[PDB]
Amino acid sequence: VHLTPEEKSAVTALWGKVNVDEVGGEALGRLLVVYPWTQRFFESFGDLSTPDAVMGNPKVKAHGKKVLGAFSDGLAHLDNLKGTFATLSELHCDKLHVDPENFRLLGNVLVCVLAHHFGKEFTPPVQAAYQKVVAGVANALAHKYH
Amino acid sequence: VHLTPEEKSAVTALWGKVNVDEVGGEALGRLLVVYPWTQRFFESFGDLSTPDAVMGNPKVKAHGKKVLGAFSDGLAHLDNLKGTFATLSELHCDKLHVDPENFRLLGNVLVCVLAHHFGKEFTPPVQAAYQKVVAGVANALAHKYH
Amino acid sequence: VLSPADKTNVKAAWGKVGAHAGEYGAEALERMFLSFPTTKTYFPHFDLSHGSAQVKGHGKKVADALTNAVAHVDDMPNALSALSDLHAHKLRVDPWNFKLLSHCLLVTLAAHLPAEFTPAVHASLDKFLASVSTVLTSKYR
Amino acid sequence: VLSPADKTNVKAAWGKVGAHAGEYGAEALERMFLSFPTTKTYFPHFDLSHGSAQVKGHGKKVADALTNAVAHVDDMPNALSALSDLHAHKLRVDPWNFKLLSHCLLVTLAAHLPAEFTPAVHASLDKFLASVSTVLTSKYR
Numbered sequence A, B: 001v002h003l004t005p006e007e008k009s010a011v012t013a014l015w016g017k018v019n020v021d022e023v024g025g026e027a028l029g030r031l032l033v034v035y036p037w038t039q040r041f042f043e044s045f046g047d048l049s050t051p052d053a054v055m056g057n058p059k060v061k062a063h064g065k066k067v068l069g070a071f072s073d074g075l076a077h078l079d080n081l082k083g084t085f086a087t088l089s090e091l092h093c094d095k096l097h098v099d100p101e102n103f104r105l106l107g108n109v110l111v112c113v114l115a116h117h118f119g120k121e122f123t124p125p126v127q128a129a130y131q132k133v134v135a136g137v138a139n140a141l142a143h144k145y146h
Numbered sequence C, D: 001v002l003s004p005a006d007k008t009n010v011k012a013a014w015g016k017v018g019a020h021a022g023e024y025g026a027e028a029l030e031r032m033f034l035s036f037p038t039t040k041t042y043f044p045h046f047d048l049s050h051g052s053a054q055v056k057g058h059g060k061k062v063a064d065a066l067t068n069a070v071a072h073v074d075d076m077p078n079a080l081s082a083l084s085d086l087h088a089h090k091l092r093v094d095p096w097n098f099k100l101l102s103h104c105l106l107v108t109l110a111a112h113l114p115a116e117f118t119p120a121v122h123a124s125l126d127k128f129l130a131s132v133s134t135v136l137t138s139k140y141r
């Protein structure tokens, strides 16, 4: 994706203070709570019947950490999101059968989480730069679907 | 976007049998009838009080000819849609203030019209090829928005 | 909100479909799988080959449900109650996909009802499919 | 639909917004214009620069409507009647845009209510904004 020098600095600077372990678990947990139908992909994760159940689920925290970690790698290759996520795109399509629309929902939930976590530091311009990033990652992950 | 040789041929072949002015007026008219909010840009076109009034409006027909003619000329440059519609994209954003969601709606209405027009000849594979074309055109027209 | 005129256009249009409902339902599904490949992620257990018995059978089920809705257009919530629970609690199809199937159903009807697919009917059918989609995703959360 | 718990969550969260509602409305708009530039096509007559009193004034009106909606959560269609007519027949804002503003309102709320924006409240507010959006676009066709 194309980011201005300003948008790039804003994104990277903010990410340096992100505890991927913590944020990843929060993002995936909220996705499963706010958009319940996304639970169809995690039947083997245990109890997800309540927000407290979902948020406390260790499997959810574990997976959330994996997802944000891979997301983290993309921030290091904003210039080539497509090639970066090619293998994971194929995996999500052929093996996991995940509707790419779910990538979009996760991107939006992640933004809400960053806002909740950072407060006033997550300014309109900073959010704008992040919306471009999550949209790019979502499109990169849906790129290999067929 | 990326069309296979066979997909390009299907689009081209079918298009050669299209009455551009006729299909143009039909598509724009149906757009204004099925999604009434799109009427917002055409207040100066006169009477749009009923479906018949819209379909029979000479201004609506004239604009449809204009729009479909540009779309028609774009089919010759399938490998460079963005470059082909760059200036029109600028115009629609800076001067006309047209929400790009309208291009997507027109794209779907156009597909319905081609199906009504060609019946059984508008096969599923042919439709799939046209869906790529209208999505590609809508994307190209929205590319310069800022 | 479906108006009385809308209900008249839909019942008239669907009537003409008549006994081809299932066949048209199958065509609409095939159009969706080809045009919007991501929708295939919900049918990994199906033989999505052209003319497959699985797709033909599913198309017939989809059409019977739409027929049921047209028959009870004034009480769709109650009429599609079971299907609403099934899509919300078991299948859990992202709402975005209903718009894609609705579009493909519209294209199928257009290609088979030359005389009946007028702009007014086109508008009423689109509203109808949107209402059905709304009812089917009403219990998601 | 909004469950009693959903209603309780929304009233509690909004009660917390209190006298800042207007300021949050303006922020939400600013977030929308910067994040989703196409939404600016509906405000060509506005000065959209940061700090614009126009955006500020409009933000307070949006917030006041949301406040009215919360107060009449069990009768939103009637309470938002005039607003539905306006958006449907005058402004004619494509429905897709309501999802963009709803998201920006949620982000603004998250940034100002660390303690109250729990996952459960987050879910309830999203349901609430989706309901408001549905009511506001119900008369489009």
Ligand code: HEM
Residues within 6 Å of the ligand: A038, A041, A042, A063, A066, A067, A068, A070, A071, A088, A092, A096, A098, A102, A103, A106, A137, A138, A141
């Ligand atoms: C957009 C950011 C996303 C990224 C970068 C991403 C990344 C990953 C990675 C790195 C794996 C691990 C694969 C392995 O270790 O073999 C994975 C697995 C998986 N992902 Fe994604 N993913 C994303 C979003 C999603 C979403 C939104 C869903 C569905 C709601 C999803 C569902 C899954 C599932 C079901 C697995 C397998 C988990 C298991 O083994 O039980 N992913 N993803």
Ligand code: HEM
Residues within 6 Å of the ligand: B038, B041, B042, B066, B067, B068, B070, B071, B088, B091, B092, B096, B098, B102, B103, B106, B137, B141
């Ligand atoms: C395939 C999609 C479209 C194409 C290729 C396209 C093409 C054009 C062209 C060639 C013009 C004339 C430009 C000029 O005067 O120099 C135009 C004008 C305009 N277009 Fe588009 N357009 C498309 C879709 C739309 C849609 C869906 C709307 C709105 C619902 C829209 C609204 C307008 C308006 C309001 C004008 C100005 C008409 C006038 O001032 O006479 N266009 N468009």
Ligand code: HEM
Residues within 6 Å of the ligand: C039, C042, C043, C061, C062, C065, C066, C083, C091, C093, C097, C098, C099, C101, C102, C132, C133, C136
């Ligand atoms: C017009 C809206 C729709 C209608 C009326 C409809 C109707 C139905 C019906 C009647 C069944 C079969 C019920 C049974 O056999 O007990 C069903 C199943 C199902 N639907 Fe839908 N559906 C709609 C939209 C969707 C969409 C958009 C998708 C996905 C892109 C979808 C995916 C499924 C799946 C995967 C099943 C189960 C298939 C199986 O494993 O047998 N449906 N639907």
Ligand code: HEM
Residues within 6 Å of the ligand: D039, D042, D043, D058, D061, D062, D065, D066, D083, D087, D091, D093, D097, D098, D101, D132, D133, D136
């Ligand atoms: C939560 C959803 C929304 C609410 C509660 C809302 C509320 C309002 C209110 C109260 C007004 C002012 C009416 C008056 O001054 O008499 C209004 C005007 C307007 N709204 Fe919305 N609105 C919503 C979403 C939208 C969206 C998504 C857009 C477009 C992106 C939009 C565009 C406008 C415009 C252009 C005006 C006229 C502003 C002017 O020129 O003064 N609205 N809205």
